RNA sequence: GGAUUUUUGGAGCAGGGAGAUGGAAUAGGAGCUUGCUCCGUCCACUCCACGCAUCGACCUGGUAUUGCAGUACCUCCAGGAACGGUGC
């Protein structure tokens, strides 16, 4: 079936999220497109490359395998999943 | 009755230092224009004053703590265990004698 | 501050209660072995209370030594008596009863109903003090010791029976070197054995027994306690013989024996003491370690179900005739049809007659009462909670309209020539003016 | 009213305006200051406005907290054992209290990490060279009375009280 | 047959699992699954170069455990 | 089912898991190379397709450098070791 | 099994990050649900300043950490 | 049973794969048990590199963080239900 | 339902050299204590390639902004580097 976490991610699409990849790549940007495999294709993202030298790219796309973390909109705290 | 308890304890303590059954600080303290309403033997609180006096006189014995030291009950769980077992055995013997008396009464 | 009267009486009462509570704890029987160990621990706590009172009282001779002359005066008295009466002639308007002088020590040094626990005996138990590999005095926790010995030795041919036989003998030929680090593991083993022996009996003299064992190690262990007929006397730590007692006295106070070795009478002292204490503990609980080996062998030899279990430790209703009803009667009366009522806690009624009667039955009337709705004919055939609450809103509003609120609707004559609710008129009437 | 842990287990520890873990004691008037460690190392800021706390003392060993708000209290003294109980704090808003004397700042040096504090609306302020004594006995502090510490105040703090 | 089924035959079993994160974690675990989800209670957790700290309730997964250890007097035959 | 469990037994008895096969047939001790160089010496109590390895009479050794690495060891008799950490499982070790 | 949503990226140049510190530019041309990407005119720029064009590559999703799009697509 | 629901709704420190912690109130779980944490902070160790500099733990703010199943190692309960 | 995105793991390991530099109150071996003599684990300072470069907050002044909004992060010069993590 479908994971409630992945439902929170799909509710976290279109708005600003902040993923953190396995190499420390911190990509805080508009999460455009995500799927069941957590493959997050985001736009206007700020990718920090783990270095603190954070740059701004557009149409970035990080897979789900590297996802150490992903801050979704906290405005989803009243999402229908947790209640 | 906390003031009354303080007064009863004070009476037991001040009678602990008297010399005889008539030689205390209470014989004249009764007629000394101050209310002492426990010394009367019709008042059951005379038993409570006598129990306070018994406790004071059992603590004012030579083994009560005047000039000696208690060491067998004060660092001796073995002596404490001997005394506890003897108290429990005396209680069992008292109950057994009571049961014999009760069978006799029935 | 009568350091001889008030303190002596309070301490005497406390110690008497402690002795009586020990007598009661020893006069009551034990039913679970953890119950017996916890009763022993509580008796230890009560005896500790009595001993603490005894020690607090044994020092009460520095002011008694000054008061022995003034307490015995036959001339003094009623002066200090009237003074104490004046000091206790404060306001006795504290109109309250309080038996909390001596009935409170009985409730502190007593037992409890859900478990035998005293006042200070509310948080003391065998739960943080007894091991589940033992059971609070059932078995022994030595699996860690076997794993530690096996990690120290590095051998894959070491079984629990060989380990237990090596650890049970009293002074036999070792399996590991005493100048090696396995003596370090023997130190932890002696610590665990001493902790188990002490936690097995909180009532027996701990200070006196430790003192007797220390006097033994001082006088009879280091002075040739295992004699011979070099074989005449042996050293326990250094591992050297002695031809005679004079030779042993010469070879104990010598130069190589004291500090001319890592196994001298300076360095190996704690190790020899821990080894002697472990041997003494094995000899004192030699039946206990044997029972623990019995439990380990029973677990290793039993079957698997017993190992797990040891580690874990017609279609129709009745009638007045007394027999079931014909199946066609059951269908004819609709007793095969189930009706549910949400107001009744989702209770299922069998057949239309039982389901019509239930609206007047206590279960439905109680459900309606829990909702704050009066059980009335208006709620007949209402089974859902939402429908009952809703229907209630409309009915409340209707009775609201038919009922006439006099004060809320009456029209009163303002003296100037105005009209306002009678309630407002009377309120304002008094309301300074009207 | 006695200060116990009912007003702790009911008090709100939440994600405050600065994105910390802040526990509110708003409307408490708690005169006894104790029994805080029942926060269980999930707190950073302890707000205790409207307290009857006549002093600043009685804090348990808390390891990671950042800020303590003692606003609208009746602080007369300053307790000495602050930093061994709060080693990692940085903000102390203890303004609007009865601080008068330079000795009311005596423990204020024990905090190695103290940077921000507020002691406004306290009579200790009308004293001459007061912020001088504060940035003098407290060298590590930078944010002093809604004003950053500076080399001028630092040189004047090292010069006077020689 | 997999031995996750054997490890499923455990609840209130005093175990010491060595997890992949340099940790030794001992306790009477709460309940096990087929994905080796071993949820611990009264947990003594010591990480690689860390202290034996205490956790009241922890839910440890399966792919993060590198070794496990069952108690001493435990029958592997009718546990597997 | 039955024939499928039999195919599993065929895979385990005549496949590459022959090490586990011998270890469970004659009760031999196998040296298991763990992913972090943890050498485990002991017999194997049960095995599966995923090489989930329950073992008895186990000893775990490694080289801990405090330099000169010294050979740290422990003796864990019974142990369950799921097939996750195994780099190799060698049926006959020389010691 | 769902294939990825990478079709708008197809026929477009991206600057991707493959693991090991690898970064390459490449033309997204085709794939499978297994995210194995087909990069034509692929050029790998190593950790140094030097860059070697490898042209036509079939790259795993197992090493690729992410990818930015050089065009707006 | 789906046990962790018996620890749902309360604040837990969830473990990552790289040695840090994330303190946040658990929302719910899935098949691989991946996490959604409300009111989350990250506790990350700061390397001393010396025997004279102490080891500190710096905290980050995340809030609602979707921690993918690649992170979950072990999780403790650190604060009561809020 | 262990083969590229979540639960049968790619993890683990070790901090560049050297100078008649310094400590191990309670813990090193051996030259069969104390003293001296050497060797296998750290930091504090000097030297070499302050391990280098980065950007991110940060501190010291000067310097520009008076501006109504829901946030990765927001003025500019400068230096020191107390901190973060990225390639070698």
From Swiss-Prot, chain A:
Function: Plays a role in pre-mRNA splicing as a core component of the spliceosomal U1, U2, U4 and U5 small nuclear ribonucleoproteins (snRNPs), the building blocks of the spliceosome. Component of both the pre-catalytic spliceosome B complex and activated spliceosome C complexes. As a component of the minor spliceosome, involved in the splicing of U12-type introns in pre-mRNAs. As part of the U7 snRNP it is involved in histone pre-mRNA 3'-end processing.
Gene Ontology cellular-component terms listed: catalytic step 2 spliceosome; commitment complex; cytosol; methylosome; nuclear body; nucleoplasm; nucleus; pICln-Sm protein complex
Gene Ontology MF terms in the entry: enzyme binding; histone pre-mRNA DCP binding; RNA binding; telomerase RNA binding; U7 snRNA binding
Post-translational modification: Methylated on arginine residues by PRMT5 and PRMT7; probable asymmetric dimethylation which is required for assembly and biogenesis of snRNPs.
Modified residues (N-acetylserine): 1
Family: Belongs to the snRNP core protein family.
Subcellular location, principal: cytoplasm
Taxonomic source organism: Homo sapiens (Human)
Top-level taxon: Eukaryota
Keywords annotated in UniProt: Acetylation, Cytoplasm, Methylation, mRNA processing, mRNA splicing, Nucleus, Repeat, Ribonucleoprotein, RNA-binding, Spliceosome
GO biological process: 7-methylguanosine cap hypermethylation; mRNA splicing, via spliceosome; protein methylation; RNA splicing; spliceosomal snRNP assembly; U2-type prespliceosome assembly
Protein name as catalogued: Small nuclear ribonucleoprotein Sm D3
Domain Sm: 4-76
Curated annotation (Swiss-Prot), chain B:
Subunit and partners: Component of the 17S U2 SnRNP complex, a ribonucleoprotein complex that contains small nuclear RNA (snRNA) U2 and a number of specific proteins. Part of the SF3A subcomplex of the 17S U2 SnRNP complex which is composed of three subunits; SF3A3/SAP61, SF3A2/SAP62 and SF3A1/SAP114. SF3A associates with the splicing factor SF3B and a 12S RNA unit to form the mature 17S U2 small nuclear ribonucleoprotein complex (17S U2 snRNP). SF3A1 functions as a scaffold that interacts directly with both SF3A2 and SF3A3. Identified in the spliceosome 'E' complex, a precursor of the spliceosome 'A' complex.
Tissue specificity remark: Ubiquitously expressed.
Parent sequence residues shown: 160 to 265 of 793
Residues of the site described as Critical for binding to SF3A3: 10
Function: Component of the 17S U2 SnRNP complex of the spliceosome, a large ribonucleoprotein complex that removes introns from transcribed pre-mRNAs. The 17S U2 SnRNP complex (1) directly participates in early spliceosome assembly and (2) mediates recognition of the intron branch site during pre-mRNA splicing by promoting the selection of the pre-mRNA branch-site adenosine, the nucleophile for the first step of splicing.
Record localization: Nucleus; Nucleus speckle
UniProt comment concerning the protein's domains: SURP motif 2 mediates direct binding to SF3A3.
Gene that encodes it: SF3A1
Superkingdom field: Eukaryota
Residue windows of the SURP motif repeats: 7-49
Organism: Homo sapiens
Signal peptide per UniProt: none
Name of the protein in question: Splicing factor 3A subunit 1
Curated annotation (Swiss-Prot), chain F:
Biased composition range(s): Basic and acidic residues: 1-9
SMART domains hit by this protein: Sm (SM00651)
Subcellular location: Cytoplasm, Cytosol; Nucleus
Gene Ontology molecular function terms on file: RNA binding
GO BP annotation list: 7-methylguanosine cap hypermethylation; mRNA splicing, via spliceosome; RNA splicing; spliceosomal complex assembly; spliceosomal snRNP assembly; U2-type prespliceosome assembly
Region described as Disordered: 1-19
Sm domain mapped to chain residues: 17-95
PANTHER family listed in its UniProt record: SMALL NUCLEAR RIBONUCLEOPROTEIN SM D2
Name the record gives this protein: Small nuclear ribonucleoprotein Sm D2
Curated annotation (Swiss-Prot), chain G:
Sm domain: residues covered: 1-73
GO CC term (a single one): U2-type precatalytic spliceosome
Keyword Flavoprotein carried by entry: no
A GO molecular-function annotation: RNA binding
Cited InterPro entries: Lsm7/SmG-like, LSM_dom_sf, Sm, Sm_dom_euk/arc, Sm_G
PROSITE patterns for this protein: SM
CDD domains: Sm_G (cd01719)
Signal sequence range: none
Keywords, in A-Z order: Cytoplasm, mRNA processing, mRNA splicing, Nucleus, Ribonucleoprotein, RNA-binding, Spliceosome
Principal place of residence: cytoplasm
Subcellular location: Cytoplasm, Cytosol; Nucleus
Taxonomic superkingdom: Eukaryota
Alphabetized SUPFAM superfamilies for the sequence: Sm-like ribonucleoproteins
GO biological process, one term: mRNA splicing, via spliceosome
Record-stated family: Belongs to the snRNP Sm proteins family.
Subunit structure: Core component of the spliceosomal U1, U2, U4 and U5 small nuclear ribonucleoproteins (snRNPs), the building blocks of the spliceosome. Most spliceosomal snRNPs contain a common set of Sm proteins, SNRPB, SNRPD1, SNRPD2, SNRPD3, SNRPE, SNRPF and SNRPG that assemble in a heptameric protein ring on the Sm site of the small nuclear RNA to form the core snRNP. Component of the U1 snRNP. The U1 snRNP is composed of the U1 snRNA and the 7 core Sm proteins SNRPB, SNRPD1, SNRPD2, SNRPD3, SNRPE, SNRPF and SNRPG, and at least three U1 snRNP-specific proteins SNRNP70/U1-70K, SNRPA/U1-A and SNRPC/U1-C.
Name assigned to this protein: Small nuclear ribonucleoprotein G
Organism: Homo sapiens
Designated gene of the protein: SNRPG
